[PDB]
Write a protein that binds this DNA or RNA. Structure first.
Ligand code: FES
Ligand SMILES: [Mg+2]
Lengths: 85, 96, 137, 99, 109, 122
RNA sequence: AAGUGUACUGAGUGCACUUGGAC
RNA sequence: CCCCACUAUGCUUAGCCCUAAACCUCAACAGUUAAUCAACAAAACUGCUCGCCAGAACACUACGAGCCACAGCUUAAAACUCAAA
């Protein structure tokens, strides 16, 4: 019931349809529509969905913390300033 | 006794809390021009707080306003209305 | 003027044209890319069926239908039909995630129709029909 | 008439300086490793800056330099850590050589 | 085994669909990896995804590194999609069989 | 209490729209509402096609009838608006100004996630 | 994958639930 | 086990049945961080109250009883056996 071609439409620039399609697919993935489509191909039972969401949140937070720790401690990799000791 | 004894006082160097861009400003379900700022241009998906940079209260207020406008015919559902594309970009997104 | 990737506003004086035709007037090339088929339909702005094509029409059978070459052949055939009908420019709109999703556009271009706007219309249900349970092998 | 420790702390320049965010200080290079300049600035820890691409040769031991302090001590708590891990070095921006 | 063959076919299709999009990662998507085949170990202990290699050695190395880094995420994505209830660890193996044909045709030309 | 009636009316002529608004206010008064104020947001294209009374429309006139009514009158008003044909879509809400703008000092600090992992010696 | 409840069928399946499993 | 179609059933109303890994497997309330503690798990405890357990299996069983309105649930044993579980 909406207007057509306003949603998920990308104008091809100079005919590089490959680039335009890549941009469109990037948009879909960023908004998670591909996630929804491929997850809704089949029915995930509510228990499984809850477990999956909890696992995803835990993994996201763990990865964020690990990356932050790695970035924080990377500075110490500088060559030894007291070599020979 | 001794005048150099450190005193019990609250932190004066403490800075005020970083008010969210909407804090203290009333969100409304008719301000489509505002709500559009917090939805995906290409799909109309509502941006999460990690993208909108809004506290929980105002994020929930924006969500409710968006849903109300969408159901009452004030806002398009599947896309940010083109009339508001030139509005200031208030969402940390990097499509390009 | 610097380029923009949003579609032109319908009912707006947009200087953009193609052979003098306005964007809304340009025919629309629906592309349905399912898991086991790819179908193309170039239809006038009044949705007059101008050209139709599919892997079944091009003769690719069963599994062979889900191939980039089959999609390219379907696109080429649809392009030839539309050209015979008098079509030059086309607004591509696609749904589904079939393998020939891009090869269909490739074949259409190879058949000689200028794609001016790539659009998606995938039927994503907010919440509706409960999908069938998951396979197991 | 001997100043107490409390008085010394009250009148210490380091106490005079408030929070060490963005403050400007005159630090001193005291150890150089290739492109790494270890600058002490009177704080507990030193900052390991890098030789700026301009006037790099002018940066030599004992050189007095300008620093924008970001944190006297670089510390943070990791996932589940019972205490903050510190890298035993401040965080500062080298603004150039003071003259 | 027919079951193993069917599993290989389904996994090949699923992995191709996964790589069709940036779902796993934008970095992986930009590399445009093409999968030659999928083979499951007889005991179901591993799934080898044979991907076609390019001529550029640095590109091959970078693609291999990214694939190794993203294998676990791809496994999780499959198990979440329920394409297979249980998926063994995924191993990406370089494929170079077509080099013989290419260089033959070059010489024969 | 104080309600707001957001009313999308079928786009049409000035005398027609005036008659429809008069009829709506008459219905409200019969239902006992004390109509406070009438606002017009003009005509505009509906965000999405809306069907009503064996018909569909793409342009509509927006209005906001702010009023006070006994709680019971709301169901009757909804029924009346639904039955009316000149109304593309009518909705009734608690008037936003009734809700108090509770003041937030700002964004409170975010500590480490609340006990997302154990504290045992592990 | 395992199991709880429940029902059909003759160990599986259906619905929900738990991780006392993997990612 | 895979594919196709389809039924109970999932839905509304009006009534029934009362069982789940009905789980944060961590009872309510108050309090403490003082000296750590089988092990793992969700750091360890104090006070106070109620409920519950006294090896395993026999046994979510039999008998009786209640609800039923007759094919089931709740309550729940005994004998025999073993030095384990
Ligand atoms: S931060 Fe105060 S209302 Fe959002
Ligand atoms: Mg039925």
């Amino acid at each position: 019931k909406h207007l057509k071609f306003i949603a998920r439409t990308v104008m091809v620039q100079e005919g590089n349809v490959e680039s335009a399609y890549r941009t469109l697919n990037r948009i879909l993935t960023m908004d998670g529509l591909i996630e929804d489509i491929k997850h809704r191909r089949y029915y995930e039972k509510p228990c499984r969905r809850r477990q999956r969401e909890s696992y995803e949140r835990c993994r996201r937070i763990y990865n964020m913390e690990m990356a932050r720790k790695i970035n924080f401690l990377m500075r110490k990799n500088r060559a030894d300033p007291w070599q020979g000791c | 006794s001794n005048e150099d004894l450190p005193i019990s006082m609250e932190n004066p160097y403490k800075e005020p809390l970083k008010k969210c861009i909407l804090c203290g400003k009333h969100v409304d379900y008719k301000n489509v021009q505002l709500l559009s700022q917090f939805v995906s241009p290409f799909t109309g998906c509502i941006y999460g707080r990690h993208i909108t940079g809004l506290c929980g209260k105002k994020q929930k207020e924006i969500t409710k306003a968006i849903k109300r406008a969408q159901i009452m015919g004030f806002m398009p559902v599947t896309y940010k209305d083109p009339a508001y594309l030139k509005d200031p970009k208030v969402c940390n997104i990097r499509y390009r | 003027t610097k380029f923009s990737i949003y579609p032109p506003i319908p009912g707006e004086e947009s200087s953009l044209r193609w052979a003098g035709k306005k964007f809304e007037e340009i025919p629309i090339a629906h592309i349905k890319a399912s898991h086991n088929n790819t179908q193309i339909q170039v239809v006038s702005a009044s949705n007059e069926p101008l050209a139709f094509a599919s892997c079944g029409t091009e003769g690719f059978r069963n599994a062979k239908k889900g191939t980039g070459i089959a999609a390219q052949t379907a696109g080429i055939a649809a392009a030839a039909r539309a050209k015979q009908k008098g079509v030059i420019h086309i607004r591509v709109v696609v749904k589904g995630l079939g393998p020939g999703r891009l090869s269909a556009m490739h074949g259409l271009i190879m058949g000689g129709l200028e794609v001016i706007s790539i659009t998606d219309n995938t039927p994503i249900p907010h919440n509706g029909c409960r999908p069938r349970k998951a396979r197991k092998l | 008439n001997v100043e107490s420790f409390a008085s010394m702390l009250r009148h210490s320049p380091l106490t005079q300086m408030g929070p060490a965010k963005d403050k400007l200080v005159i630090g001193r290079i005291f150890h150089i490793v290739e492109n790494d300049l270890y600058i002490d600035f009177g704080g507990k820890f030193h900052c390991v800056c890098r030789r700026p691409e301009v006037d790099g040769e002018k940066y030599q031991k004992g050189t007095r330099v300008r620093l924008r302090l970001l944190d006297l001590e670089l510390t943070s708590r990791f996932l589940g850590a019972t205490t903050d891990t510190t890298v035993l070095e401040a965080n500062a921006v080298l603004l150039g050589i003071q003259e | 085994h027919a079951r193993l063959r069917a599993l290989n076919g389904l996994l090949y299709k699923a992995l191709t669909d996964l790589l069709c999009t940036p779902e796993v990662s934008q970095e992986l998507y930009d590399l445009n990896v093409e999968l030659s085949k999928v083979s499951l170990t007889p005991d179901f202990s591993a799934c080898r995804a044979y991907w076609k290699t390019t001529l550029s050695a640095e590109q091959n190395a970078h693609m291999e590194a990214v694939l190794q880094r993203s294998a676990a995420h791809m496994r999780h994505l499959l198990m979440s999609q329920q394409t297979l209830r249980n998926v063994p660890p995924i191993v990406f193996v370089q494929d170079k069989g077509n080099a013989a044909l290419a260089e033959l045709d070059q010489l024969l030309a | 209490p104080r309600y707001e009636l957001a009313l999308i009316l079928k786009a049409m002529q000035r005398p027609e729209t005036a008659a429809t608004l008069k009829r709506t206010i008459e219905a409200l008064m019969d239902r006992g509402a004390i109509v406070r104020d009438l606002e017009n947001l003009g005509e505009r294209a509906l965000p999405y096609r809306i069907s009503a009374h064996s018909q569909q429309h793409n342009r509509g006139g927006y209005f906001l009838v702010d009023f006070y009514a006994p709680t019971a009158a709301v169901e009757s008003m909804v029924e009346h608006l639904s039955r009316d044909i000149d109304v593309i879509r009518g909705n009734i809400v608690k008037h936003p100004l009734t809700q108090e703008l509770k003041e937030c000092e700002g964004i409170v600090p975010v500590p480490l996630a609340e006990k997302l992992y154990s504290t045992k010696k592990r």
